[PDB]
Each structure stands twice: as C-alpha cells, then as structure tokens.
C-alpha cells in the first residue's frame, strides 16, 4: 500500500476528496503521485518523449547521465510533463513518470463555432514559452485534427484536445523546451479569463478546513 505523508495525501487516501478538481480549485500542491494514481487510475497513459544523454566533464572523463522527458495524461482533459535526469535510463524514466504525475494540470477545452456536443478545441488562442520556444494554440474547426509537430501533437492528444492549430517559433529542435512550451500553453487554458467566467466566484471550504476534524481526530 502507501502511507501518506501530507495532509492532502491523507485526505485523498481516506476517501474524502471527491475529485482531483478540488485540489486544482484550491491550487494545493501534489507532493505524492499516489494521489494522481488514485484519482485518474488506469486512464493515464504515459510515454517517453525523449531520452537525452547529458555529460559533465570531469578530470577522469565525462560523467554521463540520462534525462528522460515523459508525457502523461488521460485523453480526457488532464496532461502532465516530467523531466528527470539520473545515472540510468530506467531510473530516469521512472522518475520522469512520477514527476509528470505530480505535474498534471487540467486542460480547458472549448469550441470553434457553434457549441454543439462536447468541446473539441482550445477555448481561445493561447501561447506558451520556454526559453525561445514559443508555441501558439489556435481553435480549429471540428474534425481538423491536431495540426502540430509530433511532440506538440502527442502532448495535445494526451491533453484530450480533439483538434487544434499550432504555430511554433524558435529552436523547437530542442525537444525539452518544445514540450515545456506546449505544456505551458495547455496549462494556460484554465488561466484565461473568458466572458463566461465573469460570474463572481462562490467560495467553498478548502479541504484542509472542511475535513479538519478528520485530520485532528487521528
């Protein structure tokens, strides 16, 4: 099993956080990937976007480590990207999977034209940046598919985006920065203030407050 080490982890394990969107609502940080494992379960599909050997020059030679960039996310609105560097490829991939689980962000999906059926594309044009890599996502008509480079296409497909238009600028040949910029653009979806979100918020009790009795009683 898994013994939680955080109050949020204890609340999640003790079957009293209804959905992962409560934590996202209160911006609480996830420090144990078992929360994501419990909430998204078998819907999460991971893959290794890249393995990069990075070397540090030493007196005796070059200390070579491997950095794994791994994307993850159920194809229904949650995506995450994780980078981990370690001495061995297998340990790097394991750490990258854990980190991508920790960094899952909710993806907001929108409409291109009329709002029939489930949302298919990004709510609006959104730009992500990671060190000279600029990735812009534009809403696309239904059935367009993901018009993107392979790395952004994979990230957007894991995000659950049915179709999108993509623009890229900079040194996108560095897969890490390309992936991080696409992840930034995707995560900027729920941070964009659209007119339908102008309604004043009704604040609800944070999980550290609405089950503080369960935490203290232990």
């Amino acid at each position: 099993e898994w013994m939680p080490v955080t109050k949020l982890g204890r609340l999640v394990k003790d079957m009293k956080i209804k959905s992962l969107e409560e934590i996202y609502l209160f911006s609480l940080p996830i420090k144990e990937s078992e929360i994501i494992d419990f909430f998204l379960g078998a819907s999460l599909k991971d893959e290794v976007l890249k393995i990069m050997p990075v070397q540090k020059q030493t007196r005796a030679g070059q200390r070579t480590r491997f950095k794994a960039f791994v994307a993850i996310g159920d194809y229904n609105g949650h995506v995450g990207l994780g980078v981990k560097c370690s001495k061995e490829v297998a340990t790097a991939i394991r750490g990258a999977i854990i980190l991508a689980k920790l960094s899952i962000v909710p993806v907001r999906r929108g409409y291109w034209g009329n709002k029939i059926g489930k949302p298919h594309t990004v709510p609006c044009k959104v730009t992500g940046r990671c060190g000279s890599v600029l990735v812009r996502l534009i809403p696309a008509p239904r059935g367009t598919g993901i018009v993107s480079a392979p790395v952004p296409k994979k990230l957007l497909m894991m995000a659950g985006i049915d179709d999108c238009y993509t623009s890229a600028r900079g040194c996108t040949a560095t897969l890490g920065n390309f992936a991080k910029a696409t992840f930034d653009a995707i995560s900027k979806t729920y941070s964009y203030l659209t007119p339908d979100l102008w309604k004043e918020t009704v604040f609800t009790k944070s999980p550290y407050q609405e089950f503080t009795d369960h935490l203290v009683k232990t």
Partner: peptide
C-alpha cells in the same frame, strides 16, 4: 527493452547511439 538500454548505456555516443535511443520509445 532491457537489451536496448544495455546497448545504449554501453556506448552512449558511439556508432550504436542514435538507433538505440530511437528504439527506446520512438
């Protein structure tokens, strides 16, 4: 998968470098 990892980490920059990295996950 393990054999590819071994071949890659034996010579991470030799002749059998790009192919093994591509074969890892692609």
């Amino acid at each position: 998968f393990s054999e590819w990892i071994d071949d890659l980490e034996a010579d991470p920059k030799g002749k059998f470098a790009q192919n093994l990295l591509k074969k890892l996950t692609g």
